[PDB]
RNA sequence: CGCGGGGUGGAGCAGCCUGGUAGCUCGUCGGGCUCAUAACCCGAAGGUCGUCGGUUCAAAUCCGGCCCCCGCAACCA
RNA sequence: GCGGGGUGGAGCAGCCUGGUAGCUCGUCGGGCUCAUAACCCGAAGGUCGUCGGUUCAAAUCCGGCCCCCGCAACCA
RNA sequence: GGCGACUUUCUGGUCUGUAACUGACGCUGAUGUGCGAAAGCGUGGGGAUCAAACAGGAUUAGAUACCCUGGUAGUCCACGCCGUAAACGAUGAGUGCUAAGUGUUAGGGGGCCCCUUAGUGCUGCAGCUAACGCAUUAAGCACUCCGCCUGGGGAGUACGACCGCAAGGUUGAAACUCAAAGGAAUUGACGGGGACCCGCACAAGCGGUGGAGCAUGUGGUUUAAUUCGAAGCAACGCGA
RNA sequence: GGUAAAAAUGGCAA
């Protein structure tokens, strides 16, 4: 939980908030589970994305 | 498919009123290259506006154009509100003034143009309505400004 | 008729379809709410950041009338209007003490719907 | 025969109560945009409020009369 | 035996309650397209089954006639 | 085939080192006999989610679809049945041999480095291949054994048999018909593929055409003849 | 993240 610092802008706090969300990866997870992907497809995506990484 | 911007042509100041804008107004009024009739209409209109207004013709004309010219307009891309360029602002102002004057009911163009310029100074002309309508539709599409 | 809650929580649910902002006390009792749909935004306009801001501002203003001054922000969903809503709370005059993400995530739970083939 | 309620753009639906301030939504019309279509956005029109009186600074608004409509009693010539 | 219906080329309103021919499709002329379809625009086309009656006036009301449809056709 | 929270119980296989022991006790494998995704079937239980069928909404010329809101079987458990998948590395199993380089998993050995065993990837010789490619994880070089193929369609159909509760599975023709089916690669063309660029292509503007009268060409129609030629752009004030 | 929606057809020869 980002807490606004003393003498810190809400906009500055918002920057900190956005970064923490990115590291958490909650957005990433949400998009993946929007629609069902068959087991074989899931495994392929995991592999090739890792190949990219 | 275009190379780039093309340099714009320039106009000499109006002899009678020493305004570049006055020269551009003549150009919009002119039809079929008939400059003299266009100049005649404008100068006569400026006499009538001053006569009725009791104020300098250029002053009221400047006041009129200021009301007609629009800060924002919608462009199809969803319609997006966009800032009108300074040069575009003048084009739209002059075009709207002349076009809406032509749609007025007075018998002669000079009277129509004077009634329009007077009305626009009072912020009540059809050209003013055009700006107001343009601004309204731009505000309605404010969400798409991004 | 007039409550006096100084400290409250603002919940922003931002989706690709809509933005809803509910302001509650710390115990989860609602004070005010607004949405893009409530303000009369329709279709694409509902999900725009502008609509989210307007929803946030409306909800904040009503909540302040109950004496809310400070707010803790909880954000749920992936929609484009989350940041605008947070800024609107500050703009409305409420102070954001903390911002937290509460979007729900299963630990491999229920089957998601079919992918849209079109 | 009593009692209760209502009559408001083409229609429905408020303000009536708690007098000054006929709104709202569709149906219209003209535009914009949409390849487009629809939707959406913008402008414009249409009820003087059931009617007629009284009272009041001011009444669709209140009080009265009157008419129409609806519901419920009355329903053992 | 008794009801119902017969309306542009098709299907379907208008009749009750006389004065008013509607809607969708089709047709026709134009447009779009390389062309066709789709789509867009403009337009034409029904003596209202047929003879009579009544009426100032009949798709409309009334009576025949022809056609069609439904129902009935029982007790021995 | 498959197997992904954790814990415990029961239980299978594999790899490394060592070299106690046994002493060729091995390999393959017709017929057999088991296991075998998903859907499906039977009996009983369960039912969150998702979701054939089905029902609305929408889209459309139509929309028995795609998209939206719902929704039953099913999806789950147990015990039976079914026995099939692009059940794929479209690559049977065993054994030995044949350049290297680099990553990674589980070990072993010796000084972070080197060596080594068994997997798992990438790159790449020789050799192989129609080509694409393969290349110590061979599609190279060899030996053993098994399964399978012999143009396309008809047809995985018919009939018979066997198996199955059923759905169906396994096995499996012919008449007739054709001169082709096919694999890989190449040059083009094309795409509601991509990148990058242009052109009054669009955008931004200005003035028109389509409506009127008339001139003219054309079509059609007419006529004794209305001479012949031009026909999307690139015929139609065109040959004239 | 996106995404605009709709978007049918066209004898065999040479
Ligand atoms: Mg056509
Ligand atoms: Mg199953
Ligand atoms: Mg569905
Ligand atoms: Mg098989
Ligand atoms: Mg290896
Ligand atoms: Mg013409
Ligand atoms: Mg063809």
Curated annotation (Swiss-Prot), chain A:
Alphabetized GO MF terms: structural constituent of ribosome
Keywords noted in UniProt: Ribonucleoprotein, Ribosomal protein
GO biological process: translation
GO cellular component entries: ribonucleoprotein complex; ribosome
Classification via Gene3D superfamilies: Ribosomal protein S8
InterPro entries associated with the record: Ribosomal_bS21 (IPR001911), Ribosomal_bS21_CS (IPR018278), Ribosomal_bS21_sf (IPR038380)
A Pfam family: Ribosomal_S21
PROSITE patterns on file: RIBOSOMAL_S21
Record keyword Ribonucleoprotein present: yes
Coiled coil: none
Top-level taxonomic group: Bacteria
Presence of the UniProt keyword Repressor in the record: no
Protein family per UniProt: Belongs to the bacterial ribosomal protein bS21 family.
Name of the protein this chain belongs to: Small ribosomal subunit protein bS21
From Swiss-Prot, chain B:
Molecular function terms, GO-annotated: mRNA binding; rRNA binding; structural constituent of ribosome; tRNA binding
GO CC annotations, alphabetized: cytosolic small ribosomal subunit; ribosome
GO biological process, one term: ribosomal small subunit assembly
Described purpose of this protein according to its UniProt entry: One of the primary rRNA binding proteins, it binds directly to 16S rRNA where it nucleates assembly of the head domain of the 30S subunit. Is located at the subunit interface close to the decoding center, probably blocks exit of the E-site tRNA.
Family assignment from sequence similarity: Belongs to the universal ribosomal protein uS7 family.
SUPFAM superfamilies hit by this protein: Ribosomal protein S7
Protein name: Small ribosomal subunit protein uS7
Species, as recorded: Staphylococcus aureus (strain NCTC 8325 / PS 47)
Swiss-Prot record, chain C:
Keyword Transmembrane helix annotated: no
Keyword Ribosomal protein annotated: yes
Gene Ontology CC: cytosolic small ribosomal subunit
Record's keyword terms, sorted: Ribonucleoprotein, Ribosomal protein, RNA-binding, rRNA-binding
Annotated signal peptide: none
GO-annotated biological processes: translation
InterPro entries documented for this protein: Ribosomal_uS11 (IPR001971), Ribosomal_uS11_bac-type (IPR019981), Ribosomal_uS11_CS (IPR018102), Ribosomal_uS11_sf (IPR036967)
Molecular functions (GO terms): rRNA binding; structural constituent of ribosome
Disulfide pairings: none
Chain segments annotated as coiled-coil in the UniProt record: none
NCBIfam families linked: PRK05309.1, uS11_bact
The protein's assembly and partners: Part of the 30S ribosomal subunit. Interacts with proteins S7 and S18. Binds to IF-3.
Protein family: Belongs to the universal ribosomal protein uS11 family.
Function text: Located on the platform of the 30S subunit, it bridges several disparate RNA helices of the 16S rRNA. Forms part of the Shine-Dalgarno cleft in the 70S ribosome.
Protein name according to UniProt: Small ribosomal subunit protein uS11
Gene from which the chain derives: rpsK
